[PDB]
Structure formats: C-alpha cells, structure tokens
Symmetry: C3
Subunit: 340 residues, 3 copies
C-alpha cells in the first residue's frame, strides 16, 4: 500500500497479518509441517524515486514477525529480515541491485511456488542460489534491452558469506537465468555455481569444492488458468539433516520436480493442487534417499485484495522408515489473512 507520493518519490508500506494454524497428528515432527500455532505478521516498504525519464531508483526492506511466541525469553524466535536491498534501473539498459535478495535460480523456482500455504519446498532460505540470500549483486534486463518483447534475463554475483553454520554459509559464486513469455506461455532456465566454505566441507554430509543449482520452468498463466512445472538439479547444495545420527550437511546430488495446477474462479475461490518430489543421491552412508514427496490439495477463498482465507492439505508420501527420518505424516493448514 502506497502511503507517500510527492516530489516524485513513492513508498509502499505493505504488510500482512496472517492467522495460521497447522494440523498434524500427535505432537508434530514425524509430520510434514508440524502441529500447532503458526501465526505471523509482516511489515515492509517498497520505495521508489524517479531520477529522470529513463532512470529510476529503488529500495525495499521487509521483516518477518512471528505471532506464535510468548513475551518471555523466546520472544524473538523466528524473526528475520527477509529483504533489505537497493538498486537502479536505467531505461532499457536494465536493473542492478545490492543487499539481501532472492537468489537468481529462484526466477525458475518461482513458477511452481504458488500454493495456498506450503510448496516451494526447494526454495531454501540462505541456500546459495535457490532462495533469499544476503550480499547478492544482480543485473536484470527485460525484453532483451527492449528489443524483443517477452525475452527477459538476469545475471547474479554472490558474495562470500562465512557464517557460523555450514547450513547458512556460502563462498563466492555466480549464476544467471533467462525467461521467455508469449501470449500466456512461459519458459525459464537458471543456473548458479559457488565456492564452498571450509566449514561447509568439514560437515559430515557432502563432497565438493563447488555448489551447483539449476532449474527450469514452464508455465501457462492466462484465462484464469495457472499451470506450472519445474525441474531442477543440485550438486552439493541441498541442505539435509540425519535425524538418527543428529548429523547435518548437504546432499551430494538432488533431483527436484514440481507440478502445480490451479484455477481462479471469478467468485473468489482458487482451488489448488500440486505434486513435489525432491530426492537426494549419493548421501554418504545412505546413498539414495527421498527428501520431499507429496501430493497437495488446497484452496484459497478471496474476500478481496485485502482479505482471504485458505486451507491446504499436504499428503506426504515419505516412508516412516525414511533413511533420514524425514516426517511421513500429512499436514493441513488453516489460514486467515488480512493484508495491505
């Protein structure tokens, strides 16, 4: 929501209140999403200054505020700056931005990441190129320098982030993506590679000096129809946990498939179904093992652009004897969303 627009400068102060509850059997963990309260709220700004007829500047910040914490010592648990970056766009030259921003491979992963509650199970936070990641410099250009309508591309440089956990750490890397759209159809490819930190190599799981993530996506999004498919592979990049040994790290190689089918009725309901399967290979001590496997059925009912409610049921296909102890139970989500 835009709350300031004077002297050629405009600020969208947006956010949301998401009442959310999760339902799984018993206590939670051998489930997909867990059980209990998951309420959260968001705040953020989208700021934009027009320097001249061709040149625009912008900056955006966004925070995730949890509502499922007490006011005691754990009051801060699960809070995070999601985005904080700044950039410029000059005519048909393109845009360039630095700060904490979404990885470049996500341009593909965005295709199937559309569910009411869950989904996008391969868009891990702070996981190199597949999700939000700090210290990325990205150049983007839409329509190929303005010369070919629908042909957009991007290149991203990922700065070294030597963090405390090998899960959240990353070395220097580069990635790129191209997407093309014509009369409802879309195709996209994205690939990124990066150095790994020593702390990442000294982890029990994973072997390599280079992390690699690539993903392609197809979609049709027109006439109230949204369909999407994503296929991707990772090399020494997907974060994983051995639940029996309490050992952590990254999987040597993973194969990710996402299918999404949704329709938007004019009276407000948007039924959604999905299937996502991400399986790892050459996991040390285990070999081949499935990380994510589910069929999804759910629906969003939109009261308006300010209010909605939804329910999303994940049928988890992971086996109870999953070699990483991955939760096998189903999970259903109940949500009521006010936003601006």
């Amino acid at each position: 929501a835009e709350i300031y627009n004077k002297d050629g400068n405009k600020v969208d102060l947006y956010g949301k209140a998401v009442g959310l509850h999760y339902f799984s059997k018993g206590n939670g963990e051998n489930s997909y999403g867990g059980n209990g309260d998951m309420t959260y709220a968001r705040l953020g700004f989208k700021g934009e200054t027009q320097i001249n007829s061709d040149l625009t500047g912008y900056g955006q910040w966004e925070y995730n505020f949890q509502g499922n914490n007490s006011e005691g010592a754990d009051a801060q648990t699960g809070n995070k700056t999601r985005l904080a970056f700044a950039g410029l766009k000059y005519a048909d030259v393109g845009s360039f931005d630095y700060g904490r921003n979404y990885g470049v491979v996500y341009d593909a992963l965005g295709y199937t990441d559309m569910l009411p509650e869950f989904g996008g199970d391969t868009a891990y936070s702070d996981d190199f190129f597949v999700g939000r990641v700090g210290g990325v410099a990205t150049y983007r250009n839409s329509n190929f320098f303005g010369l070919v309508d629908g042909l957009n591309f991007a290149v991203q440089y990922l700065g070294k982030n030597e963090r405390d956990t090998a899960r959240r750490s990353n070395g220097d890397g580069v990635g790129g993506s191209i997407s093309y759209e014509y009369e409802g159809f879309g195709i996209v490819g994205a690939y990124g590679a990066a150095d790994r930190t020593n702390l990442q190599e000294a982890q029990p799981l994973g072997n390599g000096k280079k992390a690699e993530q690539w993903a392609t996506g197809l979609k049709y999004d027109a006439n109230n129809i949204y369909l999407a498919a994503n296929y991707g592979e990772t090399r020494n990049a997907t974060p994983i946990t051995n639940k029996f040994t309490n050992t952590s790290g990254f999987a040597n190689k993973t194969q990710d498939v996402l299918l999404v089918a949704q329709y938007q009725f004019d009276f407000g309901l948007r039924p959604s179904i999905a299937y996502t399967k991400s399986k790892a290979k050459d996991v040390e001590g285990i070999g081949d093992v499935d990380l994510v496997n589910y069929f999804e059925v759910g629906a969003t009912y939109y009261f308006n652009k300010n209010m909605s409610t939804y329910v999303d049921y994940i049928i988890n296909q992971i086996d109870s004897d999953n070699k990483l102890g991955v939760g096998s139970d189903d999970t259903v989500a109940v949500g009521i969303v006010y936003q601006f």
Copy 2:
C-alpha cells in the same frame, strides 16, 4: 493514525515514544517495579477491509520495541510481538479472529486496568485467559445479534502451547464472557478453563491438571468519571516464584481484588487512585501468601490526543518478610509520552 483509506481498505499505523523512568528506594531489588530507565516504543498496524455492506475483514499487528537496552547483546532484551491476528465480522452475527490476542477474562480484567503506568496486576502475559495469549480463536457478538443494545458476549477457544518454559506454556482450553452496559453503568463476567502441560505439573509450586480463571467486574464510565471494581479467582493458574528457594511455578488458588477511582478534568489533568490485592492460598511449603497488595496514587496530564505526561506512585504495602520474597519497597513512575 489513519494514513490509508482507499478501495475499501483502511490502515491505521499507530504507535508511541514513551520516555519512562521508575524511581524506587535503595536499588529496588526489593521494590514493586524496580529502578532506572524503562523507556519504550510501540508499533503496530490496524488494517480493516469492507468486503461488502455487512462484511468486514480485519488484521492487526503490534510490537513492543525497548528503549532501555544498549546497542550490544541486550539489544533485544524486552522486545516482543504483542498482538498479531486476523478475522472477520459479519453483519450482526458477530466477529471472529485468530492469532495472538487478549484473553477472554481480560474482558473483565480490563475494567480496572486504567492506571497511568502500573495496574491490571492479574493480566499476565501467556497466563492462559487473563492476558495476551498465543493461538486463541475468539468469537464475540455485540448487542446479542443486534437484538439487545448493550448485550455483548464471547466464546474463546485456546489451542495448546507446549513451550520451553513452564511459565509461558498452556494446554487446550475454552472460555467465555458476557457483558452488559447501561447508561454509564457496566457489568462483566468471564471464565476460562484449560489443561496444564506436564512440564507445568512437574513444576515445584502448584498441583492440578486443569487451570481455571474467572473474574467479574463493575464500572461507571460517564461525565469525566471512571470507577471500576474487579473480583476474580484462579485455580492452579497464577504464575509465582519462590525467591528464597529460587523455584518457580503456579499458585494453587488466588483471589484478586481491584478498586480504581479516576476523574478527567477538562483542562488536561486526570487524577487517579487505585487499590490492588491479589493473594494466594495452598502454596506448597508456605501456604497462604500475598502476591500483590498496594495503594496507588497518581495523575495523568493530557496536552492533547498526541502528547501527555504522567506520574504513578505505588505505595507498597507488601511486608519485608514476605514468604515468597516479594518486593516491599515503594516505586514511582515518571512518564512523558508522544503517540500518534
């Protein structure tokens, strides 16, 4: 402050800067509230959407940002997301909202919670139904489906919160309230029940599998006059700490009495006095004990709807040989508050 009202959506972004300092004798270890800087600020949005002529959607978030911390490690000390929920209200059927919201017994306890700084001594955070509490689904109806002016009621369902601390944990529970108001007068009733967590039962102080809180309140609110009285009882629900043995948990039974007398002068002054006594029964090893017991004298000076200053003097009646080690010294509040 209303800063957006368009396309049937309005967002009031409200908050405050509160210069706040407490003055107590010696150091205040043994006082009511303690001594030193207690400056704070609040932030929150109230978003409200008109879906159609009868149907409103709403969503709210609210934060307490501390001003008494360094820029170091304790930077987060005392910060907390206070309120965070979303819901709908439909014609005269009523309202429903889910997320983190004020407890149902607060409907009653709200009557006496009017001091300049202190007060509402039984409306504890994450204390089941008497204060702010996570994962509650609340239904309220105003004017009894529109048929009886002044007749409001509510039913509340409290979802399980299994936490790391026994103080902030709570099991599944349900509660309700009904209030009637007539020509300056008000009467309110509230009661709530819930399972206790193992972790609460395995606590040193307190025994029971069910926590129960009820309170009834009367008030006069007209012609610049505010008078209120609240009485309530709790069973295995009020949080307590043994200061000599340094052990924590909950009191077996408590009886809470609050008297409040306030007047608002037209020239900006609002003098206030109060009396608060909350006493425990069946505390293991100690027996009967006073938790809160004080007379209060103070005044709030309102410059306008945007600026005020206040003083709140807690005349502590607690005795130096209090069996729970409760502070006996006096505490003074000095506050200067800008809000918008």
Copy 3:
C-alpha cells in the same frame, strides 16, 4: 516521509535500505572495517504535534534492522533500537526530551561526522556522552531565550545503567555544551562527567572513579563548502580491547583529532576527504598507543533527495606492530543507498 498531518498532529515515517560492502585483503580480519556484506536497513518515526501556538510535543523512535544476517540463529545479530525519546518544545524557552538520544558531546563531534560511511570515530555507541546513549534527560536552548540569535546551548543528564557488559555500562552523570554560528562559521564546545560502574573498574584496563569526555569543534558551512575540525580528550571513558591478551576496558586518557573537507557539486557529486587520529595514553602495560589513524579519500554521488551511491577508501596509517593489536590494513566502502 510525512504521511500524516491532521488534527494538530504530523508523522514522518522515514528510513533507508543501504546496500553496503566492505573491501579488505584476504580474510579482512586485520583491516579497519573488515571484509564483506554489511547491508542494513533503518526504519523510524519522527512525530510532532502542535499543542498550541508556542508548545509542540514530539516523539521519535529509530530502529536498526541488519541485512547481513541469516534467517537462522544469527537473524538478530546486530539489530537494535537507535532512538526512543519523547519531549516538548516551548517557544524560545527551549526543548526537553527523555529516553535514548544522541549524547551531548556529540554536539561537537557531529561537526566531523560527515563522511560517506566512516568517520566520527570518537562517537562510540553507548559510550557515555560521545554517542547514542540510554537514559538521558536533555535540555536544549536555541538563540538563548530568543535574546541572542545563533547562540545555542545544552545540558544533559545521564541516568545510571548497570549493564551486563562494562562496555555498554554507565553510572550517574551530567554534561553540557555551547555552540555559536555566524554566516557559515561555527564553533562548539562540549564536556561531560559521570560515575563509573563497579563492572567498569573491575576491568583490566582503566583507573578512575570518574569518566570524562570533552571536545571542541570548528566548521565553515556555506556556498557548497564544508570544512570541520574536532579535538577532544577523554579521561577513563573511551573503550578499548587488547587483541593479544584478549582483555577489554577503557583507556585512561585519549587525545582525538578529526579534519573533514568536503565540497558539494551541483551535478550531484560530493567529494570528501578526512583525517582521523585518536591515540591513547596511560594504557596499562602498553603506555602510549594509537587506536585510530587514517587519511580518508572518497566521494558520494547524490541522484536526488532520495537516492545516493558512494565509494569510501580508508588509508590506514596504523602500523602492523600496533601494541593493542589494532588492524593496520586499509578498508573500502561500496554503498548504494535508497532512503525516504
């Protein structure tokens, strides 16, 4: 950005998104600012209400959100509320505010605090009177009761803060400052004295029952020209750490010099140069040693009142065999700043 001005009340919701990167050689440990991503965002309100023709009330809060932290445990590493105070201003009598606000000695050091990123190296956070500090009661007076135009002064009270770290700790104290300006020229003097906390004296480095900070400044600021000089001394007040022995505390005496020369070109560029040298004396075990010593060359390019970019190169003069183990290497800043 001012987003509300109604009913004698106005609210500025302001902030920024700063993409920022540091450049140092190798790991960057042994440099001035370090190496890597330092992206951050700030958010805040400046609220001001007109109570009547002479009296305005105000309140301000300001927060630091980091953009260089993960979403993991370190999501919070370095976030903190910067300002939180409330006050009033009456005609030419003066202004008064209490809470967390800039230290009184900052009145002088502010002169040289003009660099793109760095600079003002003696304006340490929570360092008594030299930087932002918790619990100050401040009186400020402009134009001396309206009797002498340009003659401003200030008195500041520092409340006791016995913290977890002696670094962010502080005792009872008082300070004052006076400044006069005439047709581009400015001169200011500022001094503050305060009790030290027990925890500060039990530190290995530093001896005294009183911390003292004083600084004087000159500047010329007109016709796009800015020149400034600040000199100051501290007695048992500036915080220091020995990198070899891993011990911390405060320096017995410090002598601080800052020069800044800037010119503002109309096409947006503002080239900046500076020199900062702060050297300590009576450092236990070491004697005389330099904490800060550099010549600075850099430039900021303003796209307009909302957008900027900068590069700032720090030429460090500190020697590799620095007795306090202070980094000897140079540091580069690359920043792109959107604000509102």
